[PDB]
Each structure stands twice: as C-alpha cells, then as structure tokens.
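Fold this complex.
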Amino acid sequence: SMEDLIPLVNRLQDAFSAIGQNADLDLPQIAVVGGQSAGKSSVLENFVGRDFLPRGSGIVTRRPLVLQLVNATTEYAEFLHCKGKKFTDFEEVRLEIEAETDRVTGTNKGISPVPINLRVYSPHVLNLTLVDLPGMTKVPVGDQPPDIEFQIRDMLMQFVTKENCLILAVSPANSDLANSDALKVAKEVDPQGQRTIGVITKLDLMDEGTDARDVLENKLLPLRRGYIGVVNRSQKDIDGKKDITAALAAERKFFLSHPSYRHLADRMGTPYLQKVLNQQLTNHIRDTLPGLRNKLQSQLLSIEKEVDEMLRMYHALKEALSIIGNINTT
Amino acid sequence: SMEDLIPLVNRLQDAFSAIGQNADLDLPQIAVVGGQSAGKSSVLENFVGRDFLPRGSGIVTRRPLVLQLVNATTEYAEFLHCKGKKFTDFEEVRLEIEAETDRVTGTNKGISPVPINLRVYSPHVLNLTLVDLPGMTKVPVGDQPPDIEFQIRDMLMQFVTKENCLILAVSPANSDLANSDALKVAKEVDPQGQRTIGVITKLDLMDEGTDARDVLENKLLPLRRGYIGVVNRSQKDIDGKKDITAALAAERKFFLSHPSYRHLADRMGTPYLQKVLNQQLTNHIRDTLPGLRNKLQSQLLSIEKEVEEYKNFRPRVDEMLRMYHALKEALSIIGNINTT
Ligand SMILES: Nc1nc2c(ncn2[C@@H]2O[C@H](COP(=O)(O)OP(=O)(O)CP(=O)(O)O)[C@@H](O)[C@H]2O)c(=O)[nH]1
Ligand SMILES: Nc1nc2c(ncn2[C@@H]2O[C@H](COP(=O)(O)OP(=O)(O)CP(=O)(O)O)[C@@H](O)[C@H]2O)c(=O)[nH]1
Ligand SMILES: [Mg+2]
Ligand SMILES: [Mg+2]
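Structure:
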C-alpha cells in the first residue's frame, strides 16, 4: 500500500508547484533522541532502509545530520558541503559523514552544533526530513566544554520543539527505563505524548533473569503511542560487516522465540516500527488534505464558472484535485 | 593484614572512653551513589562482607540505609525501629529492610527520605558508617512525584556534601561512562576527586566487541583515584541463591580470562576494592594518631611527677593512678598501631 501512496504524494507536491501557491502537505520531520549510545543512528538508518550512518561504541554522532529524502528517478546521494558530487556507494556516504565530522570536530571527542546536510534521492521515498543527533551526556570527556550536557540538550531542543516533529525516544533495554534521557526530554517538549514514539533497543543484552515485558506492553511507563522494541547489530556485528537482512532475520527470530515477548512479536521489530512511523505520516497527509482540497476547489470555481489566457491554472488545479481524490481512494 | 589493625583500633577507642576524652578517630562515612540499578547495594554489602541488602531489578532501595558497623564479639544486627530485637539471621535482616521500606513507601515504586537506621555488630569490623542510597532517575513511575529525580538527588546530597564522606561513584559498564549520574554528582561535590572512588560494575554484561579497558585504565574519564571494576551476581544468580564464594570465584576468573583486562586483573575485583577502601580508612587513622598521641602525652606528663612521688615517698586522690594507667594504655596501643 505504501508503494502506491508514495508516488501519488510526489505527484501532488509537484502539482502544487505547478499551481505556484504557497501550499504543501508539510510532512512532519523525524528526530531521534536519547542518551549517548542508546542506539539512535541504527534506528534512524533502519527506518530509511540503508546503511549510511556512522555507528559504534563511545561518542560517534558528533554533529546533527539533517537528512532530506527526495523522490527521484535515480538512486544516489549528495551533501550540501560537496557541491557537485553524487555518491552512489552508501559506504562512501557513511565515510564522508565521518570525515566531515572529524574535519570540524577533530578526533578527541569534540562536538559541533553545525549540521551536516544530506540529500538522498530515490523513487521509493517520501520527501521527508530526518535528523540524527548526538547522544545526551552528563560529564565532559576529551576536549568537550564543561557544559557539554547543555550544549547537546540545546542542540536537540531546536529540532524536537518544532511542531509536529515525530520524536523517536530511543532507550536501551539494558538500563532501567526510569533513567531514560529520551523519555525525560520527550515529556518536557511533548508532555501528552502526541508525537513521541518509544523505541527500546538492545533487548538482546538484558541481564539473565530480566526482561522488558512491562515496558514493551506499555505498562511500566505508559506512553500514548506505546513502545516498539528492536534488536539491532552489536559492535562485533558492525566490525564483521553483518548485513541488514541478517540483522533483521536475527531480530525476527529473537521476538518469535523469547518467552517474554512472542505474544507481542507482531508488534515488535524494525519492520513494524517502520509501519508505525509511516502510519503517523499517512495520518498527517490525510488530515491535512481536506483543508487543501477545499482551498483548491475555491480557487478552481472562480475560473471554472468564468470558463488573461492563463488557462493553465484550470488544468493545474484540476490535476491536484484529481491526485487528492486518488489519494483518498489510496 | 587489616584484621590486625581492627582489634587494636577498637581497644584504642575504648582506652579513650576510660580517660573520658574525645575518642575521635572520625572515620569517613562511605556512601554509594549512582543511577538506578548501577549495582550500589551489591557493592556496599560486598564490602561489609555479608549478604543483607535487598538487591534486584527495577527500583529496590527506596529509603536511605544508614548502617553503623560496631565492633563486638557477639556478631549480630539490630534496627533502631525494632527495639528489643537482635537479628542473627542476616537473611531476616534483608527481609526486614524490605518490609520496613514497604511499610512507609508502599509497593508501588514510592520512595521516602526517612532513613532506616541499622547497626551491625561483628568482631571483624571497624566502627564505620556506611550509607546505602536509592538510585538516581530521570522520569517517574508508579506513584512517584514528578520531581522524583530531585527528591532522590537531595536525598544523596545530604550525605555526599559532607567533607568526610567517601564517595563510591558506581557506574555500570554496559552504559556509557560519560552519561554517568554518579560521576556528575561526585564531580559537583568533590571536583578534585579527593574522596571519590570510581567503581565499574556489570563488566560481564558488556556488548560483544566492546570492553571498558580505556575506562579502567583511567584514560577515558580520568579520576584522581582511578577506577576499580567488579563483577557482581546477576538477577538469575540472586534467584538461584548463588553464594558469595562462587560469585567471587566467577569474578576473579572473569578478569583473568578476559584478554582486555588480564594485565589489570590484580587491580580489579571486590577483594581489591575492599583493600583500597581499607587503605583510605587506615590512612585517616594514621593521620589522626600524632594529634591524639600528643594530647595524651601532655596530659600524662602533668600527673607523671605526682605518680613518681607517690611511689617513692611516705604516704581518694588515686583517680590519678587510674588516669595514669589509662593514659599509659592508650599510648601503648597507639605505639602498637604505629608498628602495624
Ligand atoms: N547488542 C546490541 N548492540 C546494539 C544495538 N543497537 C545498537 N547497538 C550497539 O550500540 C552502539 C551504539 O550504536 P549507535 O547506533 O551508534 O547508537 P547511537 O546512539 O547512534 C551512538 P551516539 O549517541 O554516539 O551517536 C554500537 O556499538 C552498536 O553496535 C542492539 O539492539 N543490540
Ligand atoms: N550481571 C550482573 N548483574 C549485576 C551486577 N551488579 C548488579 N547486577 C544486577 O543489577 C540489579 C541491581 O542490583 P543492585 O545491587 O540492587 O543495584 P542497586 O543500584 O543497589 C538498585 P537501586 O538503585 O534500586 O537501589 C540486580 O538484578 C543485580 O542482579 C553485575 O556486576 N553483573
Ligand atoms: Mg548516533
Ligand atoms: Mg540498592
């Protein structure tokens, strides 16, 4: 179904452009937040469906990465800071992000508030904006300033305070949920949980004799949108270049076999997280369309009853309305 | 060995009692700080040498436990709130701590700043004050107030602000050290690191492909006194009643077999942390002795001449003799301590 909606939405956005009006679906942006090493970058790139974000132990993401997915015929990527070049090898994209980070922050744990801008072109994506962010901390290391914690907090606040921004509150299972930096920030900016999606990672690392059932069932710390558990690649896995299909296969096996979670399998995992996020995106689209539809109808009526040689407007509006109708039918 | 100093020290504090002076030997108060579930209660009871602190997953320690070790030959324990009762079964002590907590906090995650006073009598301990505290958190659960983080923080602050408080900054290895609540707290109250000891737990739970070598080698986040790693019992271990000896054996085996920690094995483990903590305690005592000795000498010398004439010339004021002997006794004990 998603494969049918995506191409229609791109057509509608183009149609709006032809109309030359300040009207857009205003798709919400996706931001990932949480304590350092919570597993944020893994979560984000999994949603996009490509291995391109630097991941590792310790401090990895040291600058915000503003990613704009752009629907296009060709599949490639390009950074704003690299005018001209078109990356087709995503490993090179990952390497470039790292290199661009080191260039500005150095290699002694430093951080920078300056975003790395990346556009990923593909015909199977929504024109979305996703933001990868540095993890929250408590004490400075290397050459970080004494107030590193607040410099990072400020950094993510500028993204998560944006209206409608979908907040991926990432928390590792091998730590008590009550210590979640992700949830604390989420509750400050979105207290009612209207745009917070709880994500519990590292389920495979829990101490023997423990499990996150109460968390995953949305009972330990209830969230309006609930919680979705995932099991991503470990350091040994990253070191060994384990591929995505294999990681996803291991995650699926994990939920189907674990005695504390198999009854929840159908609501756990990376693929299911993708569906949940895509659903929230679809909900925004369908919720925003009626207002636009009516506006376009009003604009059309004027020219329609009157039917400057600007006859194009009639067809442009007519086109947009035809697309909306198709979307409403899916 | 430490078991040599202990007997001497108690006799010293007793000698001062006979003299009616300030026994002193103001030993530092040891407190465990860290995020919720960092493994504080395990570390604390491991140092005491007995299993009696409630440990488990989720929120366990919901009230401060001010524990006073009291040297005594009978070896037992008594709670201030259990007037007239003395426990001999430390497991019953553990149950009581939990029961007493439930009585005031309920069973729905609630906490209370009202400390639980407990005294453990044993001939293998120094008159110390240990403080078990609730783990720091960020978001409330159950019927905890929305300011749970600060109530817990304030609870700890009442103990760790004291100049004479030895801070055991506990942080689990399977979490990033830079995000440690224990280290944030410790740095705020003791920036120089004069009374902070970094304890790293759960090294056995680290992700495959990672290790805490840089941490344990005092290189990632250097502390004045460094770090000591330990491997305590897991939840499964608690459920299975795994005994202390087995846990200790597994911990030692862990450091000796791990390629990243092998060369550090001799500066790692619970027995080592016990030694290090004991060293700081002993050092405090030794720093205090010169002052006490001098004070005693001055007092002695005064009556010394009076005793001299009493034993040599023709004949109650014999309170002097009692004092003479008590003072002599104390100085001798100090002398014995000085020679270790
Ligand atoms: N076992 C296991 N390891 C995981 C899981 N998710 C992430 N990791 C590991 O945790 C570490 C952090 O991964 P990463 O995706 O970079 O988290 P991040 O929060 O983006 C890191 P930073 O906060 O520095 O940007 C890596 O070593 C990765 O292999 C998981 O579900 N299971
Ligand atoms: N595998 C493993 N588990 C550990 C280790 N230390 C503690 N745990 C586990 O962590 C949990 C918490 O232990 P606890 O000693 O209560 O930590 P605490 O910080 O005192 C808990 P609170 O903050 O509620 O008081 C228990 O399930 C225990 O088995 C360790 O070194 N290894
Ligand atoms: Mg990251
Ligand atoms: Mg405890």
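The longest helix of chain A spans residues 270-306.
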